[PDB]
Design a protein around this ligand. Structure first.
Ligand SMILES: CC[C@H]1c2cc3[nH]c4c(c3C)C(=O)[C@H](C(=O)OC)c4c3nc(cc4[nH]c(cc(n2)[C@@H]1C)c(C(C)=O)c4C)[C@@H](C)[C@@H]3CCC(=O)OC/C=C(\C)CCC[C@H](C)CCC[C@H](C)CCCC(C)C
Ligand SMILES: CCCCCC/C=C\CCCCCCCCCC(=O)O[C@H](COC(=O)CCCCCCCCCCCCCCC)COP(=O)(O)OC[C@@H](O)CO
Ligand SMILES: COC(C)(C)C/C=C/C(C)=C/C=C/C(C)=C/C=C/C(C)=C/C=C/C=C(C)/C=C/C=C(\C)CC/C=C(\C)CCC=C(C)C
Ligand SMILES: COC(C)(C)C/C=C/C(C)=C/C=C/C(C)=C/C=C/C(C)=C/C=C/C=C(C)/C=C/C=C(\C)CC/C=C(\C)CCC=C(C)C
Lengths: 304, 248, 56, 281, 43, 65, 55, 43, 44, 56, 56, 44, 43, 56, 54, 56, 43, 43, 56, 41, 44, 42, 44, 31
């Protein structure tokens, strides 16, 4: 067996790289350390991390959301440390019942869920501007922010947009480990087998395609690491034999291939289709279609 | 909006699913054209441009401007001609299309097949600050943090014959990664061996890609402390071509 | 009213006319489909009642 | 029709079987011995699916379904009209998958690249064999494998999953889902990051990989690197499929009750099981 | 004001044709709405 | 290869050529036994491995109505 | 309105003809399918009732 | 302007035959609608 | 009929015989497996 | 009140007009749908009652 | 009228004939499919009732 | 740039003449096919 | 300032056309609300 | 109070205006939507009770 | 009409006859399978009824 | 109580102001929403009880 | 002193027009609240 | 003219054989359809 | 039929024979399997009933 | 840590307290009005 | 280039003769097989 | 952490204050709005 | 003359003659195997 | 001194916090 280039044979480290000073206020970066255990598969350097106000706002409101759920668990546990650890996966911060609609429910009957959801909404949005701003100050494109927006689309549909259109917060996702799994299963049951939602099927094709594509692309690059294929940016500007052998493997296998830059357009679009189509399918569930299996039978692709 | 049909059974979910197919059909067209910026137009075995070019058209040119102000345009004739090999030592094994081309001579030295190298720009790869991306360890201040240090280890070739010793390591400064091992052969010349085609044992470095007799013909670097993108392509292609052309 | 021609000095006519055409067609389909939803303005439904077609 | 650089790579050799007998290209496609057997198996499997549609009486592609033999049939080779056609298509599918992987090995050898792609694809073949061969045989019958229909094999997933209550509580299922979600997340970020550097803001030169490391260290405080992300993306996809195959391998063979009841070993530990309050009292 | 590169005279003929085309679109739209008003008014 | 040797057509008896054809065909038959044995090993091995299971493995409800 | 011929100086004729052809075909299919979905204007069902084709 | 590279006279030649085809297409379309209006009017 | 020897001028005998062995062995397996679907000829 | 023209010295006209256009269109669609969702101001159902359309 | 031949000065005959052939075949299959889906115009269903073949 | 395909005006007239012959033959068979179906099972 | 590359004279001329178009948009919108106010007042 | 113009020496005017623009719009929508929620202040369901439109 | 031979000046014969061969076979199989799907025109089913093959 | 001005030599003014803005707006919304929830201090509910508007 | 590349003079112009726009925004808001208070007081 | 490299004479020789094979293929297909029409008509 | 030998001047015999061989074996297997799927033409079950072996 | 000299920070604190005091005054005036309208004590 | 394969007319003529002999033998056996099946178990 | 410890400690003060204030509202005994409603007859 | 495989026409004849001798032996054995099955358990 | 500033400001916050706790007691006490 030859070297499969899954782990580095030798680790070499010098002074930690503090980053590029394009427009970043470099005094807002932490120190940088070196962690050897991470250097076998990737970089050994940990940090420096930029802390501006977007990240600080996101961190404090994310912590507040995390602790708001946590304190509710202590209330559910009777403030008993043993009961808290026994039932940690069974605790749930449920949304208000359906009788309150979109109003502000009492604290004990879903009001905390509304407080926690508000903190989460702030934290996610404060993190999105961090994703946008970090790319802007380095002179890079905003592809990460747009890809993140696709994940936010599904997340906002689940927690905000669909409860608004359904007319009550009760349909929102509970904040718990097993409970939000039970919510997922119950969502499929009371909408008639979410398998027959076409956009759920499209979402799964994208999710399966994402793992197929990353296995294809990850293995393709490792195959051509003999010729510096992992230096994709330099291969885009100056095409080498790594880019050609990678293109010719897939042309001779599938009949068509990508380029170094273009394979990452397949990668980003396959991945954002997971949550773009997923958000649409959840929005249609209940609001437009209440029984996907019956809807299927009407439209073919389900036996009568 | 449940049970509201524009016509027949075509409700809002039907409109969304059909709208998606139109978007997906266009997205595939967009993705396919964006992947036709390299290797086009197609050619025949005789070298002439091909009659068939496929249902998708070649996209409009786009410009990548490098840190040195090069303004690479893809797709473009000049970019394709820059990376085009000339005077290839290949002959057609049959008049029919779709058949392999037989190397006429030594494929390792002529750079054909798995030993093919691309005419990349004859300049070192450069990081953001302008310095050489790949430099020898002696040129920098780095230490072997973990793993097996290969300095001084014998180099055993594929034919189980010792060809030299490792005298230096060439590291990727921005990525903190070892790319090449500089081997000093018995003749005194120094060659670069890509780390991706070596195996560092507890007491030696083994190179199974090529045999002992092929170590003296590994392509050289003009500058002792500078490796060039073109030289990296030649060295990598030469060693990787060994798996097919070393002994048989 | 005598300087509106300078919009093309800001936006590419190729970019505008493609986006505008997609807009006008999507809007036209939206309005036609809204009418088809409402049985009072579904002209196929109205014609069926007026001319005594079957509409099984 | 060749790419502008493809000619210097079209050289003889790299075949495993047949030498130069099949060492040629048909258009873009490389044909080998395994190119020939892939075409045979793929075409036979496709034509037998159409023949199964003809026996089924429907020509709607979304309603076509080839079902395995009944559970009472055991491991016997079934009659072609009684689920034996599914068995033939399963052999054709496996023949097509395995010869496709072996064809990629020949292409890997001709191009002088690593064999990561055929090995990564073998994991996908393994998960398929778990669902149609290994698990149904461990359960004693071909009738537990999934059918060959676009929407009927989703009914198999639903019926198989609800046999053990909510299948979400399968611990290997949780690990497989987490890796599948992580793989899609890392694929989005890898595609976005490379396109961010290759397509910078207007008026900026193309970004270096130093920018890519700087961006994610600024954002997350860590960066796997260009080599690390491709290693990690490959490993995430392979582990996601592997631990998914484990979740099915233990469901109905080692575990038989509801998966939600399994998690009560943590609750029933005899030092906090009797304490009142909480969810489990 | 040269984001596109038109010479301030191509724009005048670019806009002259566009408004001529826009005028034709509005006239048909108004005639269509007048027909629907007579057929069945929505007011 | 080891089992796919070429033959000396100009210097070789008919019996040597006849044996060489059989060796070539036997090697091909051996290659064809690789997927047959692997498939047979999968089916019988998995079935054999299932015969040492907690015995509720062979009475699971059918996933088909 | 005599100057409409200058559209071809802005948009490539080959891309316009293909895009227009795809649009016109999909629009025609959409309208035919709308008529087929409504039994009153489904010309196959109308002929079935007129000629007693059973169906 | 002149993004496509055609001269002004080539545009006139191309538009002259485009409108002839468009005139032919609409002429058939109007006759098609007139036939349908007689056979099964929708107004 | 007597001119079929020219098939070896088209296909290399060294390579064809290996392919024949794969085909002939798998055909014998295919027929034996087909017999099992019928208990009357189910030898085992 | 005549210094408003300085906004273009800090805001890209190409980005403002696109943002304004999407904002103005989405705002109009929201208001039209809101009126459409209220039966009192839904102009299609109001016309149905006034003119006695079937509205099946 | 007699100037349509200039279409070939714009579109590659190889590309047009292939796309036209694919379109014509797929369109023909679509129309044959619609007729087969309609039991009144399904000529196999019509024949088996006229000649009394199987009707099962 | 109105010579995208590189054909001459003479070649286009020759190519179009053959194409219209094929188009006419295709329509003529289609008209005969519809006339036959209209007799067999009219849809109007 | 000058974050966009426009000049003092370029920006002022751009703003004049923007306000003229904005005035037309307001004028139609005001007329539309007057028509709705007459037909179906919301106050 | 005569030295509040120094804010633009600290904050980026481009970011402040965008942040202020979204904040003013989101706040205004939120207040308008709360008013619509309350039947006492829903101006649409005040006219329908005053002039008399649907009452349903 | 008599100039249809010029299609070979536009279409590569090797490309066409591969496409034509795949088309004719897949069409021929499809039509046979459609007939086999319908019991009225399934010639095997017709034979069992005629000869009492059971 | 007059040396507090030194704190601006340490913290960045941009991040302190943005932190002030988010904290103040969040607190203001929180206090208003608590009042809206309580019918005793819901100024709309008080107004409709005082003025007799809809009460629904 | 400029944290964002604005001169002191530029900050004078920017703040002056900003307060001009803010003054108009409050003035319309004050009138709007006055009208609603007269139309339907919330106190 | 000759996108495939064939000459006018070669294309005629190609087409003569292709039409010879096509006519034979159609002739058998007509006989097969006639046989099925006699055995089990579909009209 | 006297000029059919020109086929081999267009298609190389090596690829045609390989394609022809796979097609014939594929077609033969498909037809044999179709008959085996039909119990009335399954020669193994027909032989079982004629002689009497298991009948199961 | 900020990069502002003492003189430049003198007015920075003065303007902030100038704006903070105005904010407090409006809040105080609002609470006085609410006490008159709907007292909570 | 009507000699895509590189064969001459003489080589193609003798290759076609051998191919047509193999086809003829193949068709002859298939006809005999169909005659045997038709007698044993007719499908018409 | 001269400029960083202050932010974190302020959050701890803010989180605790917003927590306990709302808890007192949950308990009707410590709800000041409730007692004001009873006194003035709101 | 054609020799896609580098065998002379003489060498192809010798190899084919040996191959056909083995092919005849292989079929004869297979016929004997079928006669054993036909005697023991006929399939017609 | 940085710490000298913090202690004086922090003590004033605690001073009013104590004064507010006793303000609750005189209005509504719990102990
Ligand atoms: C295309 C769709 C896919 C996708 C894409 C995607 N996700 C993304 C992105 C993209 C492109 C980003 O750029 C963004 C990112 O930053 O990635 C690194 C992100 C992201 N996706 C994430 C998660 C995520 N993505 C998921 C899914 C997906 N993401 C899809 C598969 C999921 C799933 C499957 O559930 C998850 C869980 C994050 C890693 C990140 C966004 C993080 C974020 O918004 O965080 C805000 C901050 C917080 C919530 C704070 C959390 C604090 C902790 C709970 C600890 C608190 C206490 C502790 C003691 C610390 C101290 C606190 C105080 C006392 C100081
Ligand atoms: C204001 C509210 C409207 C909602 C936010 C819309 C977008 C606001 C964008 C503000 C401008 C911006 O993009 O600022 C961002 C922070 O915004 C932030 O926290 C925003 C914090 C609030 C976000 C969540 C708001 C509720 C949802 C980024 O800051 P930094 O990278 O740390 O700075 C580095 C230096 O240059 C100093 O600035
Ligand atoms: C849920 O809670 C409820 C809603 C119930 C109660 C809560 C209410 C709350 C929290 C209310 C909060 C309200 C606040 C904070 C309101 C603040 C409003 C402000 C500050 C508005 C300011 C507006 C300023 C405007 C509109 C300025 C406009 C300026 C212009 C139009 C001029 C253009 C600017 C130019 C040209 C600058 C460029 C110049 C140069 C030289 C570059
Ligand atoms: C759902 O709808 C259904 C399917 C039910 C109904 C729809 C049916 C449809 C749409 C059917 C469409 C049918 C069509 C389009 C059929 C077309 C058939 C054609 C064009 C057949 C042509 C056959 C031509 C043949 C077989 C030619 C053979 C030639 C030879 C045998 C000679 C070989 C010579 C060659 C190949 C080249 C000669 C070379 C030299 C150098 C002379």
């Amino acid at each position: 067996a030859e070297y499969q280039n899954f782990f580095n044979q030798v680790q070499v480290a010098g002074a930690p790289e503090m980053g590029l000073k394009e427009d970043v206020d470099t005094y807002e970066r932490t120190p940088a350390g070196m962690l050897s255990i991470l250097g076998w598969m990737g970089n050994a350097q940990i940090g420096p991390i930029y802390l501006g106000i977007a990240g600080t706002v996101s961190l404090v409101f994310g912590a507040a959301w995390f602790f708001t759920i946590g304190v509710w668990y202590w209330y559910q546990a009777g403030f008993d440390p043993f009961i808290f650890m026994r039932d940690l996966f069974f605790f749930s911060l449920e949304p208000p019942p359906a009788e309150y609609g979109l109003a502000l429910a009492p604290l004990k009957q879903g009001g905390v869920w509304q407080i926690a959801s508000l903190f989460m909404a702030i934290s996610v949005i404060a993190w999105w501007v961090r994703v946008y701003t970090r790319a802007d100050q380095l002179g890079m494109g905003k592809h990460m922010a747009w890809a993140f927006l696709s994940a936010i689309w599904l997340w906002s549909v689940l927690g905000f947009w669909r409860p608004i259109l359904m007319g009550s917060w009760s349909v929102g996702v509970p904040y718990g480990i097993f409970s939000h799994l039970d919510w997922t299963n119950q969502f499929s049951l009371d909408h008639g087998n979410l398998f027959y939602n076409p956009f759920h099927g499209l979402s799964i094709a994208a999710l399966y395609g994402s793992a197929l594509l990353f296995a294809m692309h990850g293995a393709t690059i490792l195959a051509v690491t003999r010729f510096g294929g992992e230096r994709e940016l330099e291969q885009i500007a100056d095409r080498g034999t790594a880019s050609e052998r990678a293109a010719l493997f897939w042309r001779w296998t599938m009949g068509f291939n990508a380029t170094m830059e273009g394979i990452h357009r397949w990668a980003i679009w396959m991945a954002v289709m997971v949550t773009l189509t997923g958000g649409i399918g959840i929005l249609l569930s209940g609001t437009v279609v209440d029984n996907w299996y019956v809807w299927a039978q009407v439209h073919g692709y389900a036996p009568v | 909006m449940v049970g509201v049909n524009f016509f027949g059974d075509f409700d809002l979910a039907s409109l969304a699913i059909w709208s998606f197919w139109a978007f997906l059909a266009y997205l595939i067209y967009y993705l396919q054209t964006e992947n036709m910026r390299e290797g086009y137009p197609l050619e025949n075995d005789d070298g002439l441009p091909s009659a068939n070019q496929g249902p998708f058209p070649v996209p409009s040119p786009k410009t990548f401007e490098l840190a040195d102000g090069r303004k690479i345009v893809v797709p473009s004739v000049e970019n394709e001609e820059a990376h085009r090999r000339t005077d290839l030592a290949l002959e057609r094994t049959s008049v029919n299309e779709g058949y392999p081309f037989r190397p006429t001579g030594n494929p390792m030295l002529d750079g054909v097949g798995p030993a093919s190298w691309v005419p990349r720009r004859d300049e070192p790869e450069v990081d953001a600050h302008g310095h050489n991306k790949i430099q020898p360890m002696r040129k920098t201040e780095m230490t072997v943090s973990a793993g097996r240090d290969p300095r001084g280890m014998p180099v055993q070739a594929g034919d189980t014959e010792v060809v030299g010793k490792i005298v230096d390591m060439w590291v990727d400064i921005p990525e903190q990664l070892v790319r090449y091992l500089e081997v000093e052969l018995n003749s005194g010349k120094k060659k670069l061996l890509p780390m991706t085609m070596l195996k560092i044992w507890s007491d030696r470095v083994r190179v199974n890609a090529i045999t002992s007799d092929l170590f003296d013909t590994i392509p050289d670097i003009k500058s002792p402390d500078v490796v060039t993108k073109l030289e990296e392509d030649k060295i990598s292609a030469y060693v990787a071509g060994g798996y097919m052309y070393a002994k048989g | 009213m005598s300087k509106f021609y300078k919009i093309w000095l800001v936006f590419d006519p190729r970019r505008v006319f493609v986006a505008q055409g997609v807009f006008l067609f999507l809007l036209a389909v939206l309005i036609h489909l809204i009418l088809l939803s409402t049985p009072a303005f579904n002209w196929l439904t109205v014609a069926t009642a007026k001319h005594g077609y079957v509409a099984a | 029709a060749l790419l502008s650089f493809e000619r210097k790579y079209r050289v003889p050799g790299g075949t495993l079987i047949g030498g130069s007998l099949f060492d040629f290209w048909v258009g873009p496609f490389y044909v080998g011995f395994f190119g020939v057997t892939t075409i045979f198996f793929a075409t036979l499997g496709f034509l037998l699916i159409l023949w199964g549609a003809a026996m089924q009486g429907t020509w709607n592609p979304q309603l076509i379904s080839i079902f395995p033999p009944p559970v009472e049939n055991g491991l016997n080779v079934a009659a072609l009209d009684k689920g034996g056609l599914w068995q033939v298509i399963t052999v054709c599918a496996t023949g097509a998958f395995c010869s496709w992987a072996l064809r990629e090995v020949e292409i890997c050898r001709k191009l002088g690249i690593g064999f990561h792609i055929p090995v990564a694809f073998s994991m996908a073949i393994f998960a398929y064999l778990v669902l149609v061969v290994i698990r149904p045989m461990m359960m004693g019958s071909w009738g537990y494998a999934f059918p060959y229909g676009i929407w009927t094999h989703l009914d198999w997933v639903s019926n198989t999953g609800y046999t053990y209550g909510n299948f979400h509580y399968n611990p290997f299922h949780m690990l497989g889902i987490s890796l599948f979600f992580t793989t899609a997340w890392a694929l989005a970020m890898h595609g976005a990051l490379v396109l961010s550097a290759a397509n910078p803001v207007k008026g900026k030169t193309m970004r270096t990989p130093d920018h890519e490391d700087t961006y994610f260290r600024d954002l997350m405080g860590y960066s796997v690197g260009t080599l690390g992300i491709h290693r990690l993306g490959l490993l995430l996809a392979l582990n996601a499929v592997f631990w998914s195959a484990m979740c099915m391998l233990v469901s109905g063979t080692i575990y038989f009750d509801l998966w939600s009841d399994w998690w009560y070993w943590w609750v029933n530990m005899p030092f906090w099981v009797d304490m009142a309050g909480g969810i489990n009292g | 004001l040269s984001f596109t590169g038109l010479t301030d005279e191509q724009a005048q003929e670019l806009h002259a044709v566009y408004m001529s085309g826009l005028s034709a679109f509005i006239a048909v739209a108004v005639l269509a709405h007048l027909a629907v008003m007579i057929w069945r008014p929505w007011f | 290869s080891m089992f796919d040797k070429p033959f000396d057509y100009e210097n070789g008896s008919k019996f040597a050529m006849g044996i060489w054809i059989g060796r070539q065909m036997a090697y091909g038959a051996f290659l064809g036994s690789i997927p047959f044995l692997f498939g047979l090993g999968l089916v019988l091995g998995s079935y054999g491995l299932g015969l040492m299971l907690p015995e509720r493995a062979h009475q699971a409800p059918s996933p088909y109505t």
